[PDB]
Amino acid sequence: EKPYQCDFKDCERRFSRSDQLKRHQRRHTGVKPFQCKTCQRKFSRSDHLKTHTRTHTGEKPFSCRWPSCQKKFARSDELVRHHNMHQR
Template identity: 35%
Template sequence: RRHICHICSKRFNRPSSLRIHVNTHTGATPYQCPWPDCGRYFNVNSNMRRHYRNHTNNTMDTTSAAHMSQPDS
């Protein structure tokens, strides 16, 4: 557990987990719902995917989820 949040000192096993966690402090919302004209953004990819299922009323396959969940660069 060597990845430590510089804001709250919470520790993470992976650097990717720390990056996602930092969004809670900064308010960053890099994950956009891919549904046409939805326009909602989320700070955690899994929250976006859960929201997206409200549009489709089913689960999204992981290939589509990975493709549609890349944050904007």
């Protein structure tokens, strides 16, 4: 079920997919294939580079649904936390 096993020293992680293992292993090696064209910072993952680029443009695609709240967020998890706060 999880045949892709990490063999790095002291690590026991295993994964269902080979790409998960490959992505995981960049945390051991420090390899960062993806670079921001704006600030030259490098990243282990293409999706994290994409949300990072938002920090330069101010793009915030996720809006609070609460009436009379104008708050919006770059990422969906920021909005999840925000909505959780409204109800609490």
